[model samples]
Target: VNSFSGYLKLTDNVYIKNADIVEEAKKVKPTVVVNAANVYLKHGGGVAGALNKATNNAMQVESDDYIATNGPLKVGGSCVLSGHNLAKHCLHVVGPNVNKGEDIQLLKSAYENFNQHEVLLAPLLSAGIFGADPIHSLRVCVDTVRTNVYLAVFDKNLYDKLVSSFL
Candidate 1:
């Protein structure tokens, strides 16, 4: 069903397809982009591997830094992943045991990053996680930690002010 795809670029500014995405981010003008993400390993990989991969993938994102907020990990290959992507920077919020403490940490991380003026992504592993609850995933994964605009909706002055109105 899938075929090879090539890189596509628009010379002109791309219009927002999801008006809601625009409105949502606008409602929360300074919202953060949370990457509540996790990975799976049916075998026995453990957090080390997860961290390695996460850190590695975060590296490939083409940012300035990469910060890992989990237990204790190395800081090589990637940029800087802070306790939170911290809006100013790409946020990488994760869970250790999936408890309330971690949840609060995530929330704080998100808010801080949002204020930083950087692209943020929060990823909190849900059920497949070690101690994560089935239904409590969102709370522990998204709502509890993020709870922002649900995410960020950027507004380019050039587009919002100039291009859009004329078109």
Candidate 2:
């Protein structure tokens, strides 16, 4: 019944919540909002799609220009894009696809690479179509995040599991 399920504090500066990424980003206005981007940096679906939709596709336009200039983002690599209408900036990190035999280290790198921002709003990287186990992705995030973070979990089942993990 609660729209905003409570959060779990992983550390002094890190927290996890069963919240919507877009909604949280709009409210908290973090230094950078993270986008679990594809290698192509295309805002087709998943988190990228939602953010793009919210920004009226302007983010995607900027992303297209960025990729055109800088080339496709490699796995575990990242680039910044204009937030358009959401946050000040959007940090796009290409997470590894576990289905492709990519290792956890690459996923960890996705989180570790987010070191430049003071406050970050991130989703559970690679836990969706990328075939990563939510728990493993959460562990990697908790271990590697250097700044204040709000891990906004969109899946109800995974959010319950994550809450139970801390219980």
Candidate with best TM-score = 2
Model 2 C-alpha lDDT per residue in residues 80-133, reported as the tens digit of each score: 888767888899998887888887678888888777787778888888877888
Instruction: State residue 88's C-alpha deviation in candidate 1, in Å.
Output: 7.5
Cα TM-score of candidate 2? 0.90
**What is the lDDT of every predicted structure here?**
0.29, 0.82
RMSD of each: 14.5, 3.5
lDDT of 1 by residue, 1-167 (tens): 11111212112211122122223322333234333332211112333234334444442343222213232321111123332222233333333335333443333333333334323322323223335542333333233222222321122442243223332
TM-score of every candidate relative to the true structure: 0.29, 0.90
Model 1 TM-score relative to the real fold: 0.29
Worst 10 residues of 2 by lDDT: 1-10
The number of the candidate with the highest lDDT is: 2
Give the runs in model 2 whose Cα sits over 4 Å from its true position: 1-6
Worst 10 residues of 1 by lDDT: 1-10
